[PDB]
Symmetry: C2
Subunit: 290 residues, 2 copies
């Protein structure tokens, strides 16, 4: 009867997940419980449903999962809940599932923060653009938070383009080059996806458009290197330690039915925890390498 | 066994703004159930009446008494910030629950997502109405949380149910008197309305009353909060469901957060320099008679 909590991911070796696992382990070391890290080694939906099945089979005390996409993991999550396994989602949600909580970025507010940061860098004036993936809801919320904040709070700034970077570094570089050639006086570009910041940094280096302020997303090594050398002014770090930490805190809590007595009015776990965003600049970039 | 324990000498305070209200009692029980899991002590304070500076003064009483942290429900947005902001400077952890002062130096807000509350009301309404029929909303256009509940409901009916239509959003002026009359207007102006959603606790009584008054049969009513009057109506059948805010969650996780803040458990090393989660959606529960019992005092 060893109390073990499992974290399940996709593209499991990415550095992003390491601080999630770190916050999980930090919670476990304070709770004196075991944790284990598993996941699809690749962006393969089938692989993640198979890895998640094996985890449930091992009958863990609870699972914290980041779902590759909102739907294609849901039936397996419910499988775990119906077998009595506490389940919370972190990072990437599956809102249609029986998971008791989601702990992750408020993507709209993240976009708001990028606008506020972009305005800081531009003294609240100038043309700005966005490179995004219109594929997914979470990136559209980042885009919307940025654009709406420009519209409502910085009337001397203008959003001149929202480009489709296709979640790919090369398509993002090409989109950024189109932005810079179409609006040569653009002063800032925000990328809602990691491959976007590298792509537009590569565009800005190729065109020698050294006066453009770049804001990117996430803390991949190649992004942080660009922050370190001044090519990217800031990147937005998701609260991955908070995700792992409060995921375990919530899971540990359900496994001990401390939230299901007679005087609590059902309720159960909080439905959502905003794990926050950190603006990463040259001043704190060193804190974010893996 | 976990190492997340303290001792009774740690004094955390809950602070409200209409102390005796039945609403805050499950806030307290969450607070107390967390205190017991953390082996810490908790004290309930807050304004006797609906009073701005009275709340300001009870706060000063507890900040001057050096507590290990304060959980606060703020009377309004642009208020208490300067008073709470000083509590942070003195080094006291302070989170907010139920009602938010978003411009303050408080580290987190734990409260209802009012838009998704309205979305849930729409799914619940669609449920009872098999995704077909005319529906109305009785709300306060005065407060933002009611606007978000309204907006969540109406937009979900638009986007997700084309066989349904919002035929009226009434002003129920926040009392059962005026809500009964807005409900009567809706039932008169639209005799085939099949559901009404009230975003304010007094809305539910007022429309339960209008429906009874007209001997209207198939009208599905969804109200808000868990006042005794409302819960009774849910148990008696006049109200199909009421939406309960997660007040126990507010207290329990408020204290978890103050405990983590007081003991500086959100590491600054290898943590990506994180802070406390700034928002916790303490959730909404659909109260039908299958669980109305769990929500009385």
């Amino acid at each position: 009867p060893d109390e073990k909590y499992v974290m399940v991911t996709f593209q499991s070796g990415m550095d992003y997940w390491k601080r999630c696992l770190k916050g999980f382990e930090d919670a476990a070391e304070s709770l004196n419980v075991s944790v284990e890290y598993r996941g699809a080694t690749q962006y393969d939906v089938n692989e993640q449903v198979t890895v998640l099945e094996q985890v449930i089979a091992r009958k863990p005390a609870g699972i914290a999962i980041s779902a590759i996409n909102p739907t294609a993991l849901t039936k397996t999550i419910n499988k775990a809940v119906e077998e009595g396994i506490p389940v919370v989602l972190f990072d990437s949600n599956a809102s249609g599932s029986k998971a008791f909580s989601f702990l992750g970025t408020n993507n709209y507010s993240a976009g708001v923060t990028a606008a506020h940061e972009m305005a800081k860098l531009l003294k609240s004036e100038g043309k700005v653009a966005v490179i995004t993936s219109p594929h997914q809801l979470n990136h559209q919320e980042r885009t919307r938070g940025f654009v709406e904040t420009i519209y409502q709070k910085y009337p001397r700034m203008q959003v001149v383009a929202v480009k489709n970077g296709k979640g790919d570094a090369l398509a993002s570089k090409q989109a950024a080059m189109e932005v810079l050639n179409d609006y040569p006086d653009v002063q800032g570009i925000f990328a809602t996806e990691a491959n976007g910041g590298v792509g537009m940094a590569e565009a800005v280096a190729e065109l020698n458009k050294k006066y453009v302020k770049l804001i990117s997303f996430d803390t991949e090594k190649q992004t942080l290197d660009l922050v370190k050398e001044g090519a990217i002014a800031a990147t937005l770090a998701q609260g991955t330690w908070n995700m792992g930490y409060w995921s375990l805190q919530f899971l540990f809590h359900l496994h001990h039915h401390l939230t299901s007595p007679s005087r609590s009015g059902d309720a159960l776990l909080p439905a959502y925890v905003d794990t926050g965003i950190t603006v990463v600049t040259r001043d704190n970039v060193d804190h974010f390498y893996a």
